[PDB]
Amino acid sequence: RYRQLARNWVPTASLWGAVGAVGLVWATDDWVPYINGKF
Amino acid sequence: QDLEFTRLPNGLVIASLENYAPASRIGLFIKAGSRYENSNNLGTSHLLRLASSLTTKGASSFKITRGIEAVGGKLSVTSTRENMAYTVECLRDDVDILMEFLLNVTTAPEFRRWEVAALQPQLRIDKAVALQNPQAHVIENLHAAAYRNALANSLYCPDYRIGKVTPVELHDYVQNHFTSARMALIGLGVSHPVLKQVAEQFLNIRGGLAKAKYHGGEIREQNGDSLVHAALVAESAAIGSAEANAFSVLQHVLGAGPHVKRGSNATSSLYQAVAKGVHQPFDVSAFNASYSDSGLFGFYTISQAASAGDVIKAAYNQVKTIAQGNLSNPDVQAAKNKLKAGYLMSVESSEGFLDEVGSQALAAGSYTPPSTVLQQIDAVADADVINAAKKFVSGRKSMAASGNLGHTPFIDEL
Amino acid sequence: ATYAQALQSVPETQVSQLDNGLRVASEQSSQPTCTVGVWIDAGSRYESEKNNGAGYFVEHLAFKGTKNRPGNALEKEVESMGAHLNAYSTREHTAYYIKALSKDLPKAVELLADIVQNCSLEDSQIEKERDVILQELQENDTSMRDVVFNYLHATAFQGTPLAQSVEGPSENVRKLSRADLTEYLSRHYKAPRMVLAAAGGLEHRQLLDLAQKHFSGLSGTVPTLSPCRFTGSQICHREDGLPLAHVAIAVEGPGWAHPDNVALQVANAIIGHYDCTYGGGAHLSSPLASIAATNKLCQSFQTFNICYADTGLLGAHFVCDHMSIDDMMFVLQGQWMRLCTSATESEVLRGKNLLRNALVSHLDGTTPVCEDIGRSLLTYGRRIPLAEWESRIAEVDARVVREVCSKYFYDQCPAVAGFGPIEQLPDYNRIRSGMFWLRF
Amino acid sequence: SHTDIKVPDFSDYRRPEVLDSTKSSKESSEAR
Amino acid sequence: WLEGIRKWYYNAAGFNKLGLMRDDTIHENDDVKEAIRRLPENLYNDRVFRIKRALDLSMRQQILPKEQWTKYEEDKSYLEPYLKEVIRERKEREEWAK
Amino acid sequence: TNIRKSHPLMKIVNNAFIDLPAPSNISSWWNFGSLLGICLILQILTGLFLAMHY
Amino acid sequence: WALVADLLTLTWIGGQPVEHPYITIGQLASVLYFLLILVLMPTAGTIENKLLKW
Amino acid sequence: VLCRESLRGQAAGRPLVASVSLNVPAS
Numbered sequence A: 001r002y003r004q005l006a007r008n009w010v011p012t013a014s015l016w017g018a019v020g021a022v023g024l025v026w027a028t029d030d031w032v033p034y035i036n037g038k039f
Numbered sequence B: 001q002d003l004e005f006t007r008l009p010n011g012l013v014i015a016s017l018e019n020y021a022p023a024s025r026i027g028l029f030i031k032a033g034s035r036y037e038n039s040n041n042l043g044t045s046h047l048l049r050l051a052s053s054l055t056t057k058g059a060s061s062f063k064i065t066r067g068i069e070a071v072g073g074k075l076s077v078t079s080t081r082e083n084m085a086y087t088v089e090c091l092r093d094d095v096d097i098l099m100e101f102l103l104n105v106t107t108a109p110e111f112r113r114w115e116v117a118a119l120q121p122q123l124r125i126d127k128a129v130a131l132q133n134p135q136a137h138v139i140e141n142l143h144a145a146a147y148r149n150a151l152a153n154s155l156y157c158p159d160y161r162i163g164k165v166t167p168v169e170l171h172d173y174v175q176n177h178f179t180s181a182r183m184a185l186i187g188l189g190v191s192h193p194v195l196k197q198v199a200e201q202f203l204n205i206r207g208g209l210a211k212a213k214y215h216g217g218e219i220r221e222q223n224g225d226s227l228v229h230a231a232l233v234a235e236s237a238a239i240g241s242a243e244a245n246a247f248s249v250l251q252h253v254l255g256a257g258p259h260v261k262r263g264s265n266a267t268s269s270l271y272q273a274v275a276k277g278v279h280q281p282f283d284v285s286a287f288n289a290s291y292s293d294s295g296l297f298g299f300y301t302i303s304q305a306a307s308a309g310d311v312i313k314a315a316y317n318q319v320k321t322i323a324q325g326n327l328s329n330p331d332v333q334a335a336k337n338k339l340k341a342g343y344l345m346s347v348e349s350s351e352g353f354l355d356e357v358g359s360q361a362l363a364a365g366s367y368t369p370p371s372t373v374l375q376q377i378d379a380v381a382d383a384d385v386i387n388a389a390k391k392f393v394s395g396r397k398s399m400a401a402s403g404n405l406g407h408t409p410f411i412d413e414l
Numbered sequence C: 001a002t003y004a005q006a007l008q009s010v011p012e013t014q015v016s017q018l019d020n021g022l023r024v025a026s027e028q029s030s031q032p033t034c035t036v037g038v039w040i041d042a043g044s045r046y047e048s049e050k051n052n053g054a055g056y057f058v059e060h061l062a063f064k065g066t067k068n069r070p071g072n073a074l075e076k077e078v079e080s081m082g083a084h085l086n087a088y089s090t091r092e093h094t095a096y097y098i099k100a101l102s103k104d105l106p107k108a109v110e111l112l113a114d115i116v117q118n119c120s121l122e123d124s125q126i127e128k129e130r131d132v133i134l135q136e137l138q139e140n141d142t143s144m145r146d147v148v149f150n151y152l153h154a155t156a157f158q159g160t161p162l163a164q165s166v167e168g169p170s171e172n173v174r175k176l177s178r179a180d181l182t183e184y185l186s187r188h189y190k191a192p193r194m195v196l197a198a199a200g201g202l203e204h205r206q207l208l209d210l211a212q213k214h215f216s217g218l219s220g221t222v223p224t225l226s227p228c229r230f231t232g233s234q235i236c237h238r239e240d241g242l243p244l245a246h247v248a249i250a251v252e253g254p255g256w257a258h259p260d261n262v263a264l265q266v267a268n269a270i271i272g273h274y275d276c277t278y279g280g281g282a283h284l285s286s287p288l289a290s291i292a293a294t295n296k297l298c299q300s301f302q303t304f305n306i307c308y309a310d311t312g313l314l315g316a317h318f319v320c321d322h323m324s325i326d327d328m329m330f331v332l333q334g335q336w337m338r339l340c341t342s343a344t345e346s347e348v349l350r351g352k353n354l355l356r357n358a359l360v361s362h363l364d365g366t367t368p369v370c371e372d373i374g375r376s377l378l379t380y381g382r383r384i385p386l387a388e389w390e391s392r393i394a395e396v397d398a399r400v401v402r403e404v405c406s407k408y409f410y411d412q413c414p415a416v417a418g419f420g421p422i423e424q425l426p427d428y429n430r431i432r433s434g435m436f437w438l439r440f
Numbered sequence D: 001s002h003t004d005i006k007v008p009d010f011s012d013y014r015r016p017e018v019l020d021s022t023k024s025s026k027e028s029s030e031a032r
Numbered sequence E: 001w002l003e004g005i006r007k008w009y010y011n012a013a014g015f016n017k018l019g020l021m022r023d024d025t026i027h028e029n030d031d032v033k034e035a036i037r038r039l040p041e042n043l044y045n046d047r048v049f050r051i052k053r054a055l056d057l058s059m060r061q062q063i064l065p066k067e068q069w070t071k072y073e074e075d076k077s078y079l080e081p082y083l084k085e086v087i088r089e090r091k092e093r094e095e096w097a098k
Numbered sequence F: 001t002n003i004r005k006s007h008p009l010m011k012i013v014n015n016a017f018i019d020l021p022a023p024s025n026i027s028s029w030w031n032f033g034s035l036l037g038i039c040l041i042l043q044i045l046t047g048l049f050l051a052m053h054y
Numbered sequence G: 001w002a003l004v005a006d007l008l009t010l011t012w013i014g015g016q017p018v019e020h021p022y023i024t025i026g027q028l029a030s031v032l033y034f035l036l037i038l039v040l041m042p043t044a045g046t047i048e049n050k051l052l053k054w
Numbered sequence H: 001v002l003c004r005e006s007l008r009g010q011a012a013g014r015p016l017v018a019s020v021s022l023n024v025p026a027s
């Protein structure tokens, strides 16, 4: 009940998943315009 | 909107009043105060007061606390020398849940070894905090000085016993004193048929059951507070005697405390009596305690340490005045109006009313409406008041003090 | 017959108004006793540096003789009626009030009216009350709760009148002139800023008549309140010689009128209050309290939401061992953080229920109710029915508690006050970093 | 008395946005 | 029968050879810690001893005389009641917090 | 009082390897931890010497 | 001890060329290894528990 | 306590009543 009535880390872990995605993609170096889109 | 009252065959009184308020409040009152301890189980009722959320047959220690808090609850336990009282407040929709708790704690505590062991140091904490108010020093000693037996017992466990109250002792105390015969189940904001029902099934505890002998004594506590508390009392009258009402009026003549913030107390015999000579910090008030089978009446001083002789004498003298005749009707009218007013005000609340109705249920066996009480106060004669004062001056004295008692007199110094 | 329903049945509060502007409010019941008083929008917040403490000085003189009942005549009449006369001063409000028999209400109202208006203020009595206040100040200096809270205000609203003590600085108490008390009373005790309130066995009609009869001479002819600027700040009176440390901490709150006070009080109730006599201990509902009991982190603590006009102090005060200050602060901030980010439905239901019970059970007997009437008309400009309170509480949920708490707590700068052996009281920067969470 | 502690003047160190003792600092809180 | 196997197993296990009872061998998690903590003086000191005894025997790579071995029939679950209740309590607090 | 118990460096060594409460009954199978330490020191020394020449 | 012996066997197999019968001995030894750790010794723990009336 | 004003109302006239609670401080 009260865990599941948590699941307030779902929108925060959404933003942390983009940090993980975008972070690995920055550290590693097409369809983002300007940045690398123009090698 | 009327108080309903019933007594079961087995002696259990039930009083209720459907006032259709948003809050409901139930008390289970019990002839189980400190007076019922003997020299062997001193402090047990204190522990018992502290113990109300220990595990019961019906609900865990965890469940009592969480369950009551869930619904905005309150469970609470009061002791005097003569009674204990278990009170539950809540929103009216949840009295079911709280009654369940109240019945558990009073009907089937388990007092497990480990929980009781664990609660022991609380005795010291609760006691230590209490004794911060120096009134408690004086008043507990006073009772000890005055009596030889029951009313002598303090409400707070004596040091030598902290750590040493046992499960068995807790059990005995409950089994021996929480009996249908010695309980009153009071109920504001609930239906009286439903209280009867509950009490018939759940408060069917088989009746498992000395006069307090006032002797008179004196107990001194040296420290260096530089303010000296002292109480001086003589034997009084038990509750329910018309003598009792006489003393109550004498109390309000002499003055039992202030009616005005920062007040001069123009109307308090005692206060003005002291103040005609001693012009510095002090306080004084008539003390009146009326119990089942006895009473204490007198006054309490708080004086400078050096001044205690001068203050206690000035105060005692004022009572001698009343005793030797000097009491106008103006004065006694003022006294009765005070007592009458103060009584009605003391039952203004849910709290106060519940305490009064439950109090009476044990002490008599009945309800006295406020109107009848006021009649009984009106019914006291100035002669009765002069008699009560006479009784004090002439009666054998008990005294207790605490402070730097260098200039504090012994009884036998008048 | 349910709680819902019971709320509907609660007696109506009635309000009327004189031509001079004085309001009259009452709740009627079938009691033999009543309570009646004058509430005034006056206090330390309306005082300048020069006249600070006047409101307080007046309260010492309030009952010491009128022109009509000189000297002790005032108190004599009250004592003999069996009636009870009291008073109080906040930063924003002053009250005088009498508890008496329903039968004496007309006489009571007469006495009140005599007190506020024809207060005699004798030169020689002023000289007496001078030393009394001075000594009361001495006694106050040994109340750590008093001192820390005074300090909280002093730093929280520094450079304003909200920073000022009610009692006034010792300088002012020594110097305050009879003339100055005159100015103050003349300036502030004015009918549109006063309320005659009462509960018990009484007829609203009759109260209103009595109001008209005794109070109508009162002037209604403007001291209004500047906003008060709140400041993130710390005041630390380190005094190792005291045996326990007091810490009070608070963020800027919304002020009397705002609907957030409901959701905030729900949240405050979740976190709660604790004292080492509290029976609950480890099993307690509040994590702060169970943890504080379990680990002996403190003797006591309370959450508070102190309300003023258009500002406030929202936080907590704790008293604790010289070595637990940091641990205490950490757990407490952790609570605020948890409520801002992650408050559960269930615990919010609990907070609701606490506040429900608190409101119902507080308003019990004539005095609390008389005050509620009086202050309410000063603060909300009306009395708020119990049933209204209930429907605003019912509104609050998990999301609302989260959302509101974030507004006031999450990544905001607190005001901090400690007194005593506070050597371990977290550095201000560490405190401020504790008002957010890197994980969120 | 302790009531005669007044908190010193901080004018010199304050952000300009928070100088006005008669204005809410909450207006400028998001900025700061 | 089931009981035939259980009795063989008991002797195979062999804790009985050190004069231990089954409950002495339970691995101590938090629940067990607490059950022990609720043991009355008699039962606690007895356990303290049995284990001192076994540990000292383990050191010596020795066992007791057969006469002295803990008998399958005589091995009471001294701990279960204390422990069943510790666990009931825990399960309750778990339930509650959801 | 006693150096082994006080001195910042000696305290650690004392607590670790002198006054450490060990069970009475650990077997030869508990030798291996110390032996692994030896192995490690052994490799480092012999290693260091080899590396002066390799 | 089964696991221990199996690891002795896995070692023997690993020193051998990839021919019959060793390919199949190795496959079996590999199965046995994971089987023991992930399924058999967990189970045994539990069987033992039941043999002890817990 | 350093003044009559504050001192007054201390003189006892209530035989004592101890009250301890669940979630309200003792008195």
Ligand SMILES: CCCCCCCCCCCCCCCCCC(=O)OC[C@H](COP(=O)([O-])OCC(O)COP(=O)([O-])OC[C@@H](COC(=O)CCCCCCCCCCCCCCCCC)OC(=O)CCCCCCCCCCCCCCCCC)OC(=O)CCCCCCCCCCCCCCCCC
Pocket (backbone or CB within 6 Å): E061, F027, F028, F029
């Ligand atoms: C059919 C025909 C074909 C045959 C094939 C089929 C096979 C059928 C037969 C079955 C064979 C497999 C089963 C194993 C044997 C049966 C069970 C058994 O061992 O019962 C013992 C059994 C265990 O006692 P427990 O109380 O139940 O439990 C033991 C405790 O946990 C702890 O006891 P504690 O705390 O009192 O400490 C004493 C303990 C200490 O135990 C330990 O710490 C274990 C290991 C250390 C050994 C003892 C310390 C001496 C240091 C040895 C190394 C120094 C250099 C010498 C050269 C090394 C040799 C290659 O010593 C022992 O228990 C000795 C057993 C050691 C066995 C080592 C296995 C040999 C490895 C072969 C690998 C296969 C590949 C071959 C390739 C060749 C090499 C390149 O008890 C006794 O026998 C009494 C124990 C006291 C020792 C008695 C006197 C012996 C002297 C000990 C020192 C020398 C040991 C020899 C080491 C190396 C020899 C090659």
Ligand SMILES: CCCCCCCC/C=C\CCCCCCCC(=O)O[C@H](COC(=O)CCCCCCCCCCC)COP(=O)(O)OCCN
Pocket (backbone or CB within 6 Å): C433, C434, C435, C436, C437, C438
């Ligand atoms: C040799 C070169 C090193 C460069 C890069 C090394 C790579 C290592 C990589 C990763 C380690 C990951 C974990 C880093 C944790 C850093 C500490 C941290 O997060 O602290 C921040 C702010 O930093 C504070 O401490 C606040 C003050 C400001 C200081 C900056 C952060 C400290 C370390 C970063 C410096 C490069 C939060 O701490 P607080 O403000 O105290 O608030 C937290 C409580 N709610």
Ligand code: HEM
Pocket (backbone or CB within 6 Å): F040, F043, F044, F045, F046, F047, F048, F050, F051, F054
């Ligand atoms: C865990 C610790 C170490 C292990 C397990 C280890 C293992 C090995 C092994 C297996 C070899 C091959 C030996 C051979 O067959 O010739 C070797 C060689 C070597 N190791 Fe290490 N070593 C360790 C630590 C070190 C350290 C600390 C150094 C130098 C600082 C070192 C230096 C060397 C050198 C120079 C060789 C080449 C000479 C030779 O083959 O004997 N080793 N090491």
Ligand SMILES: CCCCCCCCCCCCO[C@@H]1O[C@H](CO)[C@@H](O[C@H]2O[C@H](CO)[C@@H](O)[C@H](O)[C@H]2O)[C@H](O)[C@H]1O
Pocket (backbone or CB within 6 Å): G019, G020, G021, G023, G024
């Ligand atoms: C038993 C049946 C009667 C006739 C055969 C008698 C010979 C003895 C039985 C084994 C027969 C050999 O036949 C078989 O050859 C293959 C190829 O090397 C090996 O077996 C292996 O084959 C490949 C090896 O790359 C693996 O993918 C496979 O998983 C594995 O079983 C074994 O050695 C044997 O299973």
Ligand SMILES: CC1=NC2=C(COCC2)C(=O)[C@@H]1c1ccc(Oc2ccc(OC(F)(F)F)cc2)cc1
Pocket (backbone or CB within 6 Å): F016, F017, F022, F023, F026, F030, F031, F033, F034, F035, F036, F037, F038, F040, F041
């Ligand atoms: C601490 C310790 N506790 C226990 C046991 C046995 O069980 C009880 C606990 C031990 O046997 C031991 C132990 C461990 C190592 C050791 O000797 C060294 C020290 C240092 C070293 O170099 C290194 F790099 F590691 F530092 C190499 C060997 C002696 C004793």
